[PDB]
C-alpha cells in the first residue's frame, strides 16, 4: 500500500530522531552502521535526510561510533518481527508461503493416512473376529494365500 516509502517512521519517531539519542538512530541503521537501501527499507525522504544529518552530527561530536550500532539488540523490539508461526499474506519471500502450503498439505495427508490406517485396522480386526476360515473367501485362500511382493516379501533390495 506504501511502495514509495512515505509511511514510516511514526511522527513521534520523527520528533525523537535527533543526534542526541542513538537508540532511535540505530532502529533504521544496519548492524554495521550503514543505511538500509530504499529497496529493503523505504524510509521517507525526510526520514533519510534527518537520519543522515543526525548520524553525521553524532559521529562528529562523538555520541555515535563510526561503524556499528550500540543499540542493535535493544532496537529489535521496535523492529518488526516476521513470526514463522503466524503467516503474513504480503510476505516478500516465497519460502514463508511454501512452508505454510506444505504444512496444510501435510495436515491433509495426515487426515487421509489416519483414516486409511483406521480402516485397515478395523478390517483386519473384523476378519480375525469372524475367523481365518470363515472370513477369507475360497479364491483368497487358494491363490492370494502365499508369500508375494505384496504379502510379506523378503527384502527386495541388495546390501541388507
Amino acid at each position: 500500500k506504501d511502495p514509495q516509502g512515505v509511511q514510516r517512521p511514526s511522527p513521534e519517531v520523527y520528533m525523537k530522531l535527533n543526534y542526541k539519542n542513538p537508540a532511535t538512530i540505530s532502529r533504521f541503521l544496519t548492524r554495521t552502521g550503514h543505511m538500509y537501501p530504499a529497496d529493503i527499507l523505504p524510509l521517507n525522504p525526510e526520514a533519510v535526510v534527518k537520519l543522515r544529518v543526525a548520524k553525521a552530527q553524532a559521529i562528529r561530536i562523538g555520541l555515535y561510533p563510526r561503524f556499528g550500532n550500540p543499540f542493535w539488540f535493544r532496537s529489535q523490539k521496535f523492529r518488526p518481527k516476521a513470526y514463522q508461526e503466524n503467516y503474513d499474506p504480503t510476505t516478500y519471500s516465497t519460502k514463508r508461503t511454501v512452508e505454510h502450503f506444505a504444512y496444510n498439505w501435510v495436515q491433509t495427508d495426515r487426515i487421509r493416512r489416519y483414516f486409511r490406517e483406521l480402516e485397515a485396522v478395523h478390517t483386519s480386526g473384523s476378519a480375525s473376529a469372524r475367523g481365518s476360515g470363515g472370513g477369507t473367501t475360497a479364491e483368497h485362500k487358494q491363490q492370494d494365500q502365499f508369500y508375494s511382493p505384496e504379502n510379506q516379501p523378503i527384502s527386495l533390495h541388495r546390501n541388507n
Binding site: 511454501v98 502450503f101 501435510v106
Partner: protein, 145 residues
C-alpha cells in the same frame, strides 16, 4: 516461459528444492540424532534413525506434491504471466535510458542549462585540509568550475 521477454533460467530455485534455501523439518529429531551420533555412546542409534525415518516418511509425498504444483505453476505462467520473448528486457541499466536521461535533464536545468551528463572533478583524499589558501577545496558543479 519468458517473463518480460526474458526466459526463466531456473525454476527450481523458486521452489527451493536441491538448493541452499531449503525447509527445516523435524529439527528436534535431527538434532537428537546428530547429538547421539556425535557422542561416543555404546551402540549405533538405530532407534533415533527409526524416529527420524518415521518423521520424514511423508517428505517424499510432500516433495512430489510440490513438484506437481510447480509444474502447474509453470503451465499457468506460460498461459498468462509472460509474453514468450516478446517484450524488451527490463533488467539492465541500458534498458532504462529514459530515467537516467531525465536525471541528466534535471541536473542540466539546475546548472543553468550548460553541462549535460557531466560530473564534478575528482578531488584529493584530503583536498579540503591539505590545499593551501587561494585554492578551491570543496568541488564545484561542472558549470561553476
Amino acid at each position: 516461459p519468458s517473463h518480460s521477454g526474458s526466459p526463466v533460467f531456473t525454476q527450481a530455485k523458486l521452489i527451493g528444492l536441491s538448493g541452499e534455501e531449503q525447509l527445516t523439518m523435524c529439527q528436534s529429531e535431527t538434532m537428537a540424532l546428530r547429538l547421539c551420533m556425535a557422542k561416543a555412546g555404546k551402540e549405533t542409534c538405530e532407534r533415533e534413525s527409526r524416529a527420524l525415518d518415521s518423521c520424514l516418511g511423508r517428505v517424499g509425498h510432500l516433495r512430489r506434491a510440490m513438484s506437481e504444483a510447480c509444474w502447474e505453476f509453470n503451465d499457468w505462467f506460460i498461459q498468462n504471466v509472460s509474453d514468450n520473448h516478446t517484450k524488451p528486457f527490463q533488467h539492465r541499466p541500458h534498458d532504462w535510458r529514459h530515467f537516467y536521461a531525465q536525471e541528466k535533464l534535471v541536473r542540466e536545468r539546475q546548472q543553468n542549462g550548460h553541462a549535460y551528463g557531466r560530473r564534478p572533478k575528482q578531488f584529493s583524499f584530503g583536498a579540503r585540509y591539505v590545499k593551501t589558501d587561494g585554492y578551491g577545496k570543496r568541488p564545484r558543479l561542472p558549470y561553476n568550475k
